[PDB]
């Protein structure tokens, strides 16, 4: 029982793969509670090696994802692979583990899928396994900076919200894109772009922070950078130039369900970067105070930010407070905090984390965001302000 949770890994590229440089670590620090037991990759040659470089003692490597899906040694499987192969992958996992009955958990990353209905589906599906907990990687939620704001507010430190203002950066939808960057990231049809991911990530944490969902909203999407600069490995740019069909900027406003609190948010696509302002900020106007979060990298999900707040200690005598946590490895720290939420509940099914302070978010959550994101999309397109108050309901 009090016996590691054995992770099966889909997307373990090698010793220097994304997940290698993030999840892997998340599970060292939890060696006590998690064990990596299986690695799927489509060439055995590659699993074996990853196991080598990393010395995964308990790992055994797979060639088939059916092959995988079956190992009645995996209580929980992680899926961290391109989102366009997110639908493919997952689903099979699902249908090809029905017999496996210690698989109790299936983790996946934001964006759950690459199209709502495509994830809608993966959702509709997830649903049947009486015995399954799903998990979306909205590491946004676990950030000392986020939780902290969230606690500040909740306790009436800043009163009732008034206004909210935002800012972000996609990174690579700038006037500059990097040598190594995946063309797909930029294939319109990818299902990967600013909103979807970056913003999706962002906004959600806000709906998360405030802890109120949206009621109605408006969105507008721009494409004025139709060709970009290529960067040599060092970042020095190069006379060479490339095509984007994923958008360069999006504007969005909406009225928060709770309070009719209004929200302003302008998301830049990349470079050049704002130089007279933080490229990442959340400006919350409270009634007894203010709370601002600021990053130079709009990747809150991954970023170590800083939090300034001001207002009443408790919730007339207002106070200032600066919350920044020097050298905290958000990059990895953050996933780690989601693995604990999981361990917690396990060594200690759920529906969605929602607005709850413990637990972790689910495909329910993955979905609601997803759902809401189509909105954004439909909204710009339709050139109308839509009501996103049923987003949170299903059957």
């Amino acid at each position: 029982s009090s016996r590691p949770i054995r992770v099966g890994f889909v997307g373990l590229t090698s010793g220097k793969s994304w997940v290698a440089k993030t999840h892997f670590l998340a599970i060292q620090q939890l060696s006590s509670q998690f064990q990596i037991v299986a690695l799927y990759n489509p060439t055995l040659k590659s699993s074996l090696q990853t196991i080598e470089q990393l010395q995964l003692k308990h790992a055994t490597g797979f060639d088939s994802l059916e092959s995988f899906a079956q190992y009645k040694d995996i209580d929980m499987i992680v899926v961290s692979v391109k989102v366009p192969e997110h639908y493919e992958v997952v689903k099979n996992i699902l249908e090809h583990s029905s017999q496996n009955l210690n698989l109790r958990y299936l983790y996946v990353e934001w964006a759950l899928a690459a199209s709502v209905q495509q994830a809608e589906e993966l959702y509709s599906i997830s649903q049947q396994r009486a015995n399954l907990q799903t998990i979306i990687c909205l590491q946004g939620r676990k950030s000392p900076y986020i939780v902290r704001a969230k606690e500040l507010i909740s306790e009436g430190c800043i009163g009732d919200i008034n206004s909210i203002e935002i800012s972000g950066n996609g990174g690579w939808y700038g006037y500059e894109r990097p040598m190594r960057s995946p063309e797909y990231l930029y294939d319109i049809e990818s299902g990967v772009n600013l909103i979807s991911n970056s913003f999706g990530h962002t906004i959600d944490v806000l709906q998360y922070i405030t802890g109120s969902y949206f009621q109605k909203i408006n969105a507008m999407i721009s494409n004025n950078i139709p060709t970009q600069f290529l960067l040599d490995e060092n970042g020095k740019r190069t006379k060479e130039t490339i095509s984007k069909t994923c958008p360069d900027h999006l504007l969005f406003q909406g009225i928060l369900e709770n309070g009719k609190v209004p929200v302003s948010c302008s998301f830049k696509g990349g470079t050049p970067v704002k130089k007279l302002t933080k490229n990442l900020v959340i400006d919350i106007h409270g009634t007894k105070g203010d709370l601002k979060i600021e990053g130079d990298a709009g990747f809150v999900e991954i970023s170590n930010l800083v939090l300034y707040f001001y207002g009443i200690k408790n919730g007339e005598e207002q106070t200032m407070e600066v919350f920044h946590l020097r050298n905290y490895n958000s990059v990895v720290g953050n996933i780690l905090r989601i693995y604990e939420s999981i361990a917690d509940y396990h060594f200690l099914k759920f529906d969605k984390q929602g607005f709850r302070f413990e637990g972790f978010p689910t495909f329910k959550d993955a979905i609601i965001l997803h759902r809401l994101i189509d909105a954004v999309f439909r909204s710009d397109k339709e050139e109308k302000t839509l009501d996103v108050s049923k987003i949170m309901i299903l059957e």
């Binding site: 990174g171 970067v273 490229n279 990298a297 990747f299 970023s303 170590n304």
Partner: peptide, 14 residues
């Protein structure tokens, strides 16, 4: 002093 996350970094890890 605040060691915040710089995109430049971000680029490295990613």
């Amino acid at each position: 002093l605040f060691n915040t996350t710089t995109m430049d970094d971000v680029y490295n890890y990613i």
